[PDB]
Amino acid sequence: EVHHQKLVFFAEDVGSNKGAIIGLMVGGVV
Amino acid sequence: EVHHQKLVFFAEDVGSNKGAIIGLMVGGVV
Amino acid sequence: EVHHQKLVFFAEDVGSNKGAIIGLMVGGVV
Amino acid sequence: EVHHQKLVFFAEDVGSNKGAIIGLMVGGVV
Amino acid sequence: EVHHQKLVFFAEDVGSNKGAIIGLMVGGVV
Amino acid sequence: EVHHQKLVFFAEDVGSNKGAIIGLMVGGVV
Amino acid sequence: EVHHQKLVFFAEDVGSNKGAIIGLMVGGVV
Amino acid sequence: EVHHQKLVFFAEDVGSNKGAIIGLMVGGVV
Amino acid sequence: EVHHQKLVFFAEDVGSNKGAIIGLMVGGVV
Amino acid sequence: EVHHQKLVFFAEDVGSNKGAIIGLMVGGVV
Amino acid sequence: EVHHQKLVFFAEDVGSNKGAIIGLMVGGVV
Amino acid sequence: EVHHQKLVFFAEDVGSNKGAIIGLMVGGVV
Amino acid sequence: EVHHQKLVFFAEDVGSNKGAIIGLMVGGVV
Amino acid sequence: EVHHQKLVFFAEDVGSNKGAIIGLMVGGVV
Amino acid sequence: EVHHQKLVFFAEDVGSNKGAIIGLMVGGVV
Amino acid sequence: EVHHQKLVFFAEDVGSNKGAIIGLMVGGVV
């Protein structure tokens, strides 16, 4: 069999002063 | 078998002073 | 079999003073 | 059994003064 | 069995004054 | 049984005055 | 078996005045 | 077996005065 | 301000032979 | 401020032969 | 300002033969 | 500024023959 | 400023024959 | 300013015959 | 300022016949 | 500054025949 998985995310900001607390959680189980 | 898994993340911030707290978490299990 | 796994993360900041606290955690279990 | 795993991370900072505290943890178990 | 694993990390800083505290931990178990 | 593992890390600092405290730890267990 | 392992680390410093305290530890257990 | 392992560390220093404390530990147990 | 947060999860199984490929990932950003 | 955060995960598997592939990913950003 | 953060993970296995591949990634950025 | 952070992980194995490949990566950035 | 950080990890193995390949990576950046 | 950091890791092996290849890498950057 | 750092590692081996290749790397940069 | 750094490693060896190769690298630069 053939499995094609494509995960893409776009995140842009303009945090001039203090971008605060930001976390990016990426998980992939196969 | 043919497995094609691609993960792409775009995080761009135009900061100027103090990025603060950023946490990138990448968890891949295969 | 054929296994193709690619992870690309783009993190670009422009904070010209005090990056503060930035953490990148990459966990790959195969 | 053709295993192809590639992980590419791009981290660009511009902190002209005090990069502060940054941590990069890469865990590869195979 | 053919295993091809490549880890590429780009870390570009521009801290003209005081890098402060940076930590890079690369853990590879095979 | 062919194993090809390559780890390439690029770390560029521009701390013209006082690099301060930088730590790079590489752990390869084969 | 055929084992090919390459560990390439690039560390560029520009600490013209006082490097302070820098540490690099690479442990390879095969 | 065919063992082709090599570690290359690039330490580019631009320190004009007072290198201070620098720790370079290379532990290769094979 | 007072904030209380507790994440409790229970995962029990009986994988006598081959626990397969599982990945427990949790993320908390505050 | 008063912040109380607790994360508890219970993973109990009565394995016998070959645990297979298990990847635990804990990402906390504060 | 009082911060209380506690993380506890219980991973109990019984696999009496070949654990295979188990990885635990703990990333804490604060 | 009263910061209290505790991380406790329990990993109990019973692999009486060939633990195989197990990796524990702890990344703490404060 | 009062900071209390505790890292406690319990790893109990019973591999009476061949522990194989284990890797513990502890990275702490303060 | 009071900083209290404690790291305690318990690794118990029972490999009566051939411990094989074990690697413990501790990286503390303060 | 008061700095208290304690690193305690317990490594119990029972390799009665041929320890093979074991490596422990402790890197502390202050 | 009040510096109280303590590093202790407890190595329990039960090797009776052929310890083989063991590498203990302790690098603490202050």
Cα separation, K29 vs P21, in Å, equals 37
Test J10 with I6 for CB contact under 8 angstroms: no
Query: Is the Cα torsion angle J11, J14, J19, J21 positive or negative in sign?
Result: negative
Shortest CA distance from E24: residue in chain L? L27
Q: What is the CA P22 to chain-centroid distance, rounded? A: 11
Three-state secondary-structure class, residue G10: strand
Beta bridge partner(s), residue D30? none
Domain range for K13? 1-30
Interface present between I and H (3 or more CB pairs within 8 Å)? no
With helix as H, strand as E and coil as C, how does chain E read? CEEEEEEEEEEECCCCECCCEEEEEEEEEC
User: Which of O7, O25, O26 is the best residue to mutate to test the F interface, defined by the most F CB atoms within 10 Å of its own CB?
Assistant: O25
CA-CA distance, N12 to N27, in Å (whole number)?
21
Q: How far apart are CA L5 and CA K27, in angstroms?
A: 13
Cα distance between residue I7 and residue I1, in whole Å: 20
Q: What are phi and psi of M18, to 5 degrees?
A: 65, 105
How far apart are the CA of E21 and the nearest CA of chain L, in angstroms? 10
The two structure tokens encoding residue A3:
């499995």
Total domains in chain F come to 1
Interface test with B, best of J26, J29, J30 (most B CBs within 10 A): J29
8 A C-beta contact, residue I7 and residue I28: yes
Plot region of M28 (φ>0 → left; ψ -120 to 50 → alpha; else → beta): beta
Distances (CA, A) of D21 to E6, E21, G21, O26: 27, 5, 15, 21
Cross-chain residue pair O23–H27, CB shorter than 8 Å: yes
Instruction: Specify the 3-state DSSP secondary structure of N16.
Output: coil
Name the residue among B21, B25, B27 with its Cβ closest to that of J30: B21
Q: CATH no. for residue L30?
A: 4.10.230.10
Whether residue A17 contacts residue C20, with contact meaning beta carbons closer than 8 Å, is answered with no
CB nearest F5 (choices: G1, G5, G15): G5
**Plot region of M16 (φ>0 → left; ψ -120 to 50 → alpha; else → beta):** alpha
Q: CA-to-CA distance for P10 and B25, rounded, in angstroms?
A: 33
Please tell me if residue B8 touches chain J, with a CB cutoff of 8 Å. no
